[PDB]
Ligand binder design. Structure first.
Ligand SMILES: CCOc1ccnc(CCNC(=S)Nc2ccc(Cl)cn2)c1F
Lengths: 402, 535
């Protein structure tokens, strides 16, 4: 059957433009869609349908096969919320993700909602009008899909949830997250076991990331410049740790000495510093994850394939922070790196709070939109805006535990 | 000439109803005119005729071709459909064919069936000094196009499938068919296609009554193996008006893409201060010399070729000046597929390199539309230059496979701030401040070498001062300088090695920066105890 679904009141179907695609991707898509058409999963539509959603194709990791991807961000934003989170995986030793997008195709979609899922396969040089379709089943990448399939999902897993109430399983979108403390040996087998349990009907390490300290410089001899830079970082720091003191230091900096000038540290100053090092040894107090408010992800490009991020719902009250060292292959590609980055981070938030954060990407919209798809690999698409990395915030996070 | 294709289901925007506007009285010569013409449309396939039911009057005036309607209201109340023509096929994306024919499907609108439950919402009225409705897509109606296309689209599917080596392109009430079949072979399929479209009510012209190459396009002259920039020439004028120049400068601009070398800086001049569009402007000698010299250029047209899937795509770029770039895509050297130019301005910061980057990005997407591929790039920039630049820039940047080309002028980095203080180099502690409200401030410096300076500034802001401080420092300082400052805003600006701004002032600094041997810029927190920034 199929349960009636609706858009939140007042709202209407997405009418988002199709970004142009590469031939390679188009052929792939056309192929995919035609097959899916035959199977009756989707159907060509007419002009009376004025809605549209972007689509593209991405080859999965360790796969040479083209996967069709749709951006229902807008649509999801508009579909009625359905009111239907584990702290386990958060703490688990190891987690693996499962793509159950297929599950969804089995189930049909309310006929009256189908219109909204209209999407468009573009043609090169505008030579031919585009190829328009709409789903007949529950589409992948739709928030309504996991919801309507929720029920069936449970029973499907029960026999394992019961056979293994020692393991955890959180579902999010076309994703299935599972984490145990068993060694990768007895682990992969249970995963692959479960995996089979599913095929029947038809790594990660959460214990290694949370937040890091702000290591501070430490030299033999300090020059005016050195001292200044330091003071700069601290002052800003104080915003998180109001206990941070910078007087003793700021004294040494009195006069108009050349930057290169070397300066000896007041024993008074040494204490000052010492006290700040002490403080900065641990994440500040009073940081709570509020679920009523949105989760934020700031990312700074540190250069040399280096990238630093902070997740927070409120400024200077990060919940987590980290670094990310580019993967051998992006030897010269910033966009590749950033994407990968963005990806990990989203993935983590899911694990943690099982909820996607909104990004603040240090990159032109133009750039990001011409290529992001070309490196993307995930059933989901987070929210994002583009910004101008404030020079301060960088010099600060550049100072992370190395 | 009716079609047996199933109508598409059309609805009125939810919550709204068919029109009710009034018909405006007409001459008797126009009454008896529409009278005996409608009588036609009726027996045929178009109109019906109705009475007191479905009171959706719609205006029906008449004008001769030295019947007709107006649905403006209806349209308003009709739903929305899909994007009919997200953009036009640009020549460079075509492949050469052996033979091309275009079939004008004129009154194809009127050949397509309308949605019955909708026809209703179409009504007439013809006062005899006589009321109809529609049953087919009517000229001027919101959905006629989107629907007619779609209809056409289906009708073609089988054929397209059966005759795959035949490329049909739909545009408005026109069909563009190409192929690599020898002549007679082609003619035959054309009729096969033509008689196919007729097995559906959409009647078309006989080969005896068809259009012949070359064909005119988006300003192009098209041949089956070559396209030619439809040569163009400006008018010789005795009295130049405002509007005139505007239009000229416009038509001139279009051209500059194809014929880079065209200029208009001195014509654009003519517009400064114009009082009215119909105004008549004198012609600077510099202005004449440009017109003439531009006309010389617009003489010899441009020859070109199409896209060969077999060959790879090459895009090469040159900097026609600061922020103005020229590019040409091709496969066989000098066998241009496309050419173009971009000339962008900016904000408080930019640099050739990033600008070069933006050109590249554009070209790419442009290419992706035209060829679904991105070309290999030939960029007037040294790999090292690029390398040292991007690896350090704060924003994420990239360039698809590109390769250097020593085709000066090359885009380079006009300067680079030191990464550490310069030993044995003066150290200036600049600082600037001005009273927000009263545009008047001061900004000066003081070095370790005890040199000092401060100027009063009548009419200014804060940042103007800060930046100024820095400018000063730069002016009188020497090839090697250390500059500490507390300007959050200033930091970023300079930091990002800009080589061109909107602010003369910033530019000021840029020159200065360029001039020095080594410059280290340092930022320190504001209003704390930090020396220099204290005195
Ligand atoms: C005025 C050109 O008409 C067309 C426009 C767009 N598309 C087509 C069909 C595609 N034909 C191809 S690959 N190339 C092609 C080459 C030369 C000429 Cl004159 C027309 N078409 C056309 F025939």
């Amino acid at each position: 059957e199929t349960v009636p679904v609706k858009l939140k009141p007042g709202m209407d179907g997405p009418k988002v433009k199709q970004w142009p695609l590469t031939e390679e991707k188009i052929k792939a898509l056309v192929e995919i869609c035609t097959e899916m058409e035959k199977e009756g999963k989707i159907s060509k539509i007419g002009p009376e349908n004025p809605y549209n959603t972007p689509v593209f194709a991405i080859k999965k990791k360790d796969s040479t096969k083209w996967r069709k991807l749709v951006d229902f961000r807008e649509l999801n934003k508009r579909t009625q919320d359905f009111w239907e989170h584990p702290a386990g995986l958060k703490k688990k030793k190891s987690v693996t993700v499962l793509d159950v997008g297929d599950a969804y195709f089995s189930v049909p979609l309310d006929e009256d909602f189908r219109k909204y899922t209209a999407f468009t396969i573009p043609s090169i040089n505008n030579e031919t009008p585009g190829i328009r379709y709409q789903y007949n089943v529950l589409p992948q990448g739709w928030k309504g899909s996991p919801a309507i399939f929720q029920s069936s999902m449970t029973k499907i897993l029960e026999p394992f949830r019961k056979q293994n109430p020692d393991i955890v399983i959180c579902q999010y979108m076309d994703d299935l997250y599972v984490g145990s403390d068993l060694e990768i040996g007895q682990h992969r087998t249970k995963i692959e076991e479960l995996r089979q349990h599913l095929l029947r009907w038809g790594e990660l390490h959460p214990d290694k990331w949370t937040v890091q300290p702000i290591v501070l410089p430490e030299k033999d001899s300090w020059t005016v410049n050195d001292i200044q830079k330091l003071v700069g970082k601290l002052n800003w720091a104080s915003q998180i740790y109001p206990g941070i003191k910078v007087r003793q230091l700021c004294k040494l900096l009195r006069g108009t000495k050349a930057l290169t000038e070397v300066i000896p540290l007041t024993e008074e100053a040494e204490l000052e510093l010492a006290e700040n090092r002490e403080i900065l040894k641990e994440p500040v107090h009073g940081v709570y994850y509020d679920p009523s408010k949105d989760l934020i992800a700031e990312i700074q490009k540190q250069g040399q394939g280096q990238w630093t991020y902070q997740i927070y719902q409120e400024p200077f009250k990060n919940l987590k922070t980290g670094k990310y060292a580019r993967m051998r292959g992006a030897h010269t590609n910033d966009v590749k790196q950033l994407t990968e980055a963005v990806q990990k981070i989203t993935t983590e938030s899911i694990v943690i709070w099982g909820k996607t954060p909104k990004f603040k990407l240090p990159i032109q919209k133009e750039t990001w939109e011409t290529w992001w798809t070309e490196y993307w690999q995930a059933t989901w698409i987070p929210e994002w805006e583009f910004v101008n990395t404030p020079p301060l915030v960088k010099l600060w996070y550049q100072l992370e535990k190395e | 000439p009716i079609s047996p294709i199933e109508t598409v289901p059309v609805k009125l925007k939810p919550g709204m109803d068919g029109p009710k506007v009034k018909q405006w009285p007409l001459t008797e010569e126009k009454i008896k005119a529409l009278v005996e013409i409608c009588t036609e449309m009726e027996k045929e396939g178009k109109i019906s005729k109705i009475g007191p039911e479905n009171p959706y009057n719609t205006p029906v005036f008449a004008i001769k071709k030295k019947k007709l309607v107006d649905f403006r209201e209806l349209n308003k109340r009709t739903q929305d459909f899909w994007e009919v023509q997200l953009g036009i096929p640009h020549p460079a994306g075509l492949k050469k064919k052996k033979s091309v024919t275009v079939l004008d499907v004129g009154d194809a609108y009127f050949s397509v069936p309308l949605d019955e439950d909708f026809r209703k919402y179409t009504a007439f009225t013809i006062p005899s000094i006589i009321r109809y409705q529609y049953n087919v897509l009517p000229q001027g109606w919101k959905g006629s196009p989107a629907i007619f296309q779609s209809s056409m689209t289906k009708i073609l599917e089988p054929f397209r499938k059966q005759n795959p080596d035949i490329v049909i392109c739909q545009y408005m009430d026109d069909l563009y068919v190409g192929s690599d079949l020898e002549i007679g072979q082609h003619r035959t399929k054309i009729e096969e296609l033509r008689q196919h479209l007729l097995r559906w009510g959409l009647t078309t012209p006989d080969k005896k009554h068809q259009k012949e190459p070359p064909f005119l396009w988006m300003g192009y002259e098209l041949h089956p193996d070559k396209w030619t920039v439809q040569p163009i020439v400006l008018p010789e004028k005795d009295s130049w008006t405002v509007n005139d120049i505007q239009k000229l400068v416009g038509k001139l601009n279009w051209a500059s893409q194809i014929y880079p070398g065209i200029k208009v800086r001195q014509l654009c001049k003519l517009l400064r201060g114009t009082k009215a569009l119909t105004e008549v402007i004198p012609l600077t000698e510099e202005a004449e010399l440009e017109l003439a010299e531009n006309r010389e250029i617009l003489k010899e047209p441009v020859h070109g070729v199409y896209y060969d899937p077999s060959k790879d795509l090459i895009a090469e770029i040159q900097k026609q000046g600061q922020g103005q770039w020229t590019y040409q895509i091709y496969q066989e050297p000098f066998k241009n597929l496309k050419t173009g130019k971009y000339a962008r301005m900016r904000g408080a910061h930019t640099n050739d390199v990033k600008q070069l980057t933006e050109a590249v990005q554009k070209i790419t997407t442009e290419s992706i539309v035209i060829w679904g591929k991105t070309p290999k790039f030939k960029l007037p920039i040294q790999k090292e230059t690029w390398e040292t630049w991007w690896t350090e820039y704060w924003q994420a940047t990239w360039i698809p496979e590109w390769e250097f080309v020593n085709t000066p002028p090359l885009v380079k980095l006009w300067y680079q701030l030191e990464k550490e203080p310069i030993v044995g180099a003066e150290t200036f502690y600049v600082d600037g401040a001005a009273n927000r409200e009263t545009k008047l401030g001061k900004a000066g410096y003081v070095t370790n070498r005890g040199r000092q300076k401060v100027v009063t500034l009548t009419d200014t802001t804060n940042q103007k001062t800060e930046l100024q401080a820095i400018y000063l420092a730069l002016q009188d300082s020497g090839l090697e300088v250390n500059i500490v400052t507390d300007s959050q805003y200033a930091l970023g600006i300079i930091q990002a090695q800009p080589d061109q701004s909107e602010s003369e002032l910033v530019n000021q600094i840029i020159e200065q920066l360029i001039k020095k041997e080594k410059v280290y810029l340092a930022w320190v927190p504001a209003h704390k105890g930090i020396g220099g920034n204290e005195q």
